[PDB]
Design a protein around this ligand. Structure first.
Ligand code: HEM
Length: 213
């Protein structure tokens, strides 16, 4: 069984749970405020910072290297424009760093430092999602929050070096299938992908509590 297929199978059920999180329902219903959006976006800032720092540490390692697409995928410079937009010039000393965000960053550093062969799980989970449901979330954000088509505030959702997200995703899946793959690596990669989804679910449960409690 191809890694891309194995991953899709392993994560299809938790994906259902992820897209039907309370925070995400509210999001999809058009019920998303400036405050909430700022929270989530700050949290993603720390997360992709960690992910991308670990991608860079392992860019020449053959267990990840074929998935190394900084120009097309990396989100950090984008998230920097977005933080400046949402939090202002001094956003670096403004933005929150929640405990669930930290738990996520911490795992990212463990994977990147000790188990680089799983790093694919974490890039899969985030980047492919961004190129799928992220695109739908983007249109909802624009309508709900009156964000202009020029794109300010939504750099995270914008992939100017990818012309066709669908064909790119196909390319990425195919590449995933060229990684050296043993049963031990395949099993563990698909477990880590599930953990990645859970980390995301936990982040959203925490953001939603913060918006109420
Ligand atoms: C309202 C929220 C969401 C919607 C509407 C949504 C929608 C989608 C749709 C329609 C696809 C299929 C596209 C294709 O086959 O190429 C997809 C794939 C994916 N999504 Fe989501 N999604 C949402 C949230 C999430 C979250 C929170 C994550 C991860 C944290 C995520 C990760 C992925 C991944 C990794 C894939 C690729 C599956 C694969 O083709 O192997 N999605 N999503």
């Amino acid at each position: 069984q191809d890694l891309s297929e194995a991953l899709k199978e392993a994560t299809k059920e938790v994906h259902i749970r992820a897209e039907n999180s309370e925070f995400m329902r509210n999001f999809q219903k058009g019920q998303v405020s400036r405050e909430g959006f700022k929270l989530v976006m700050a949290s993603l800032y720390h997360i992709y910072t960690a992910l991308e720092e670990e991608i860079e540490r392992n860019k020449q390692n053959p267990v990840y290297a074929p998935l190394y697409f900084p120009e097309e995928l990396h989100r950090r410079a984008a998230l920097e424009q977005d933080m400046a937009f949402w939090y202002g010039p001094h956003w670096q000393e403004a933005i929150p760093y929640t405990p669930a965000t930290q738990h996520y960053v911490k795992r990212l550093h463990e994977v990147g430092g000790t188990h680089p062969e799983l790093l694919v799980a974490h890039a899969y989970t985030r980047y492919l999602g961004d190129l799928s449901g992220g695109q739908v979330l983007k249109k909802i954000a624009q309508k709900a929050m009156a964000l202009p088509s020029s794109g300010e505030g939504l750099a995270f959702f914008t992939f100017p070096s990818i012309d066709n997200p669908t064909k790119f995703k196909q390319l990425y899946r195919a590449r995933m299938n060229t990684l050296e793959m043993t049963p031990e690596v395949k099993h563990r990669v698909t477990e880590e992908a599930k953990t990645a989804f859970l980390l995301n679910i936990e982040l959203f449960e925490e953001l939603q509590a913060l918006l109420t409690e």
